[PDB]
């Protein structure tokens, strides 16, 4: 995995790759690494595939029970803390989870929370998580500004995953884009690296290390 | 009188009144009939409704592919006992790769109902059951009572006015026992038997409930338009 999400002027961008690995064996190229918890909450996932898949689906159930009981959508903070408290109970047992709970609420505004399987929980504006996080950070940080447009921000998120998909051997397949606004999350399509790479190379003039 | 406070108390004449009061809940329940031949076993159950706007209370429950029962009395107690039978039938399959014998099914129900009649705090089950099945020794029909007494029969009936159907079957014994290789005729005999327990009301399409198990027939329940054939 490589997953990122960053806050900016126009809300939150969330981008993930789609590769699953079993060592050096490529297990899948078409895996969904953004779980849609509700119309206003997204959860990225990185690490152990089953742990991530199981516990984030479980998280969605706990968030549903919250709004049934409290007649109000759960806060991003409370949602992230349900998960972090859960993994903390399993600390030492060997769970592997790198999630980023991204969403919007009235009281909080656009919010991102990094949570991982050894109990760390951090609020922040920018995060990159997974085996190829460093590759994504390199492109994202060097081009990031708060005043990015929705169009430019979407592309930067896409381009950052692409960068990591290229260099990281344990990342690739395709890019799944999302945009979180005050009105909720909006899906911005699946982008296969097979076509996206050459499209970006030609149009942008980048990736000069590769034989064109 | 003074000896009916709980199930742990005997009367001076040696009676268990709480068990007898549980037996009384069955007589209040709607009539249901059981009968069998050598090839098939049939359950016929008169379902009861609260009013015209309500649905008709489901009487028949499936336990396994080869076994099931009909109830009369407290329905939740039938659900508890049927669930226990489902587990016991299932235990026999998973562990021994063996379909549970209908006779053992009865023995297990007897022993479960008994424990409730000897201990303080608990209560007897308030329901009677008619278990049918087809196993390695052919077709079977059992009658369960919450006292613990289980009885294997050619035919029987329990519930309100069940004596009418039970007398008919006692007369028809020689006829319906030899209905071999003919499901529809064995059901007809069961539908005619339950009709002897009817007063004022008659058998309608959403009132009647029939179930059958046999040699090359899994336990299946018929309701709604599927029982219109037999009216």
């Amino acid at each position: 995995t490589t997953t990122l999400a960053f806050r900016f002027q126009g809300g939150i961008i969330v981008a993930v790759d789609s590769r699953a690995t079993a060592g050096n064996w490529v297990a899948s190229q078409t895996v969904k690494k953004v779980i849609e918890i509700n119309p206003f909450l997204l959860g990225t996932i990185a690490g152990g595939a089953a742990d991530c898949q199981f516990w984030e689906t479980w998280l969605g159930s706990q968030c549903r029970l919250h709004e049934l009981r409290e007649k109000e959508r759960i806060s991003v903070a409370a949602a992230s803390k349900i998960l972090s408290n859960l993994v903390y109970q399993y600390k030492g047992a060997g769970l592997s989870m790198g999630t980023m709970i991204c969403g919007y609420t009235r009281k909080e505004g656009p919010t991102i929370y990094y949570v991982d399987s050894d109990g760390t929980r951090l609020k922040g504006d920018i995060f990159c998580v997974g085996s190829g996080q460093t590759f994504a950070y390199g492109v994202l940080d060097s081009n990031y500004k708060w005043d990015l447009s929705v169009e430019d921000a979407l592309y930067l998120g896409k381009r950052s995953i692409l960068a990591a998909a290229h260099r990281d051997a344990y990342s690739g397949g395709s890019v799944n884009l999302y945009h979180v606004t005050e009105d909720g999350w909006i899906y911005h399509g699946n982008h296969d690296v097979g076509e996206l790479f050459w499209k970006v190379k030609e149009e942008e003039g980048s990736f000069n290390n590769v034989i064109g | 009188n003074n000896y009916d406070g709980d199930t742990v108390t005997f009367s001076p004449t040696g009676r268990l009144f709480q068990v007898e009061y549980a037996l009384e809940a069955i007589k209040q329940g709607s009539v249901t009939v059981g009968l069998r031949s050598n090839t098939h076993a049939v359950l016929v159950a008169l379902k009861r409704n609260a009013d015209e706007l309500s649905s008709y209370q489901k009487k028949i429950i499936k336990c396994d592919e080869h076994m099931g029962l009909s109830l009369a009395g407290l329905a939740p107690d039938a659900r508890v006992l049927s669930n226990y039978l489902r587990q016991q039938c299932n235990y026999s399959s998973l562990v021994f790769n063996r379909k549970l014998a209908v006779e053992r099914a009865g023995h297990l129900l007897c022993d479960k109902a008994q424990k409730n009649t000897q201990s303080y705090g608990g209560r007897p089950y308030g329901v009677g059951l008619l278990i049918i099945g087809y196993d390695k020794s052919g077709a079977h029909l059992l009658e369960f009572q919450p006292s613990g007494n289980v009885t294997e029969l050619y035919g029987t009936a329990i519930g309100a006015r069940s004596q009418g159907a039970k007398t008919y079957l006692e007369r028809t014994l020689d006829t319906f026992i030899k209905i071999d290789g003919n499901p529809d005729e064995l059901i007809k005999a069961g539908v005619e038997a339950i009709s002897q327990s009817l007063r004022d009301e008659s058998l309608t399409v959403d009132n009647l409930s029939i179930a059958i198990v046999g040699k090359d027939t899994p336990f299946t329940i018929y309701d709604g338009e599927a029982v219109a054939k037999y009216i």
Binding site: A20, A22, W25, A27, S28, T30, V31, K32, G48, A49, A50, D51, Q53, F54, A93, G94 | K62, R86, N90, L94
Partner: protein
Amino acid sequence: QFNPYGDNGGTILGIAGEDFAVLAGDTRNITDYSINSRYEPKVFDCGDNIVMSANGFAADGDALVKRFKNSVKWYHFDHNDKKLSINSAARNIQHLLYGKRFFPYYVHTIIAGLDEDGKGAVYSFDPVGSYEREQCRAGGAAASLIMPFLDNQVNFKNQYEPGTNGKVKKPLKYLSVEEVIKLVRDSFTSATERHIQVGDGLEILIVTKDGVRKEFYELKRD
């Protein structure tokens, strides 16, 4: 020290069509360098038009299938004989597998059938419950041999339209049951040639709206 796991070898394969789905698996069962059985089926009809196979450690595999078969049975009892949809079965299986997260079932599980729109569906699992719907999946010992062949022939990967300067991809289309069975047979014969734990026989279970049909084919016994 006692080792609770073993490797019973073999390999399995699931392919989905437009109105059908197949789940194939070889009938060989092994331990180390010995053959235990030349015909030991590991692809099972589980009811509700769902076929299942859990390849890897046979004891765990049989245990899982046995539990899922039982899960289907109790689903009928508890929900008024409702048909278990393939998507619902898949989620149920995840919980069975993840239930033993810290002492796993050493199996790669594949199920096949039809979705609620009547279209062919293949779901595949890792040992601890991770799952994903696909048109195509090979599992087991020879999965590394068969899977890339399926990417090429089922999903037309790396295939472009001739004379288009590698710009237009080969268009995706459903395969006929006849064409799918050809790919299955060739996949297993190829795997039998190069993998020692694969051979003896091939058993395919085909799933259509009409029901579950079987087909058997001989494989090399060396």
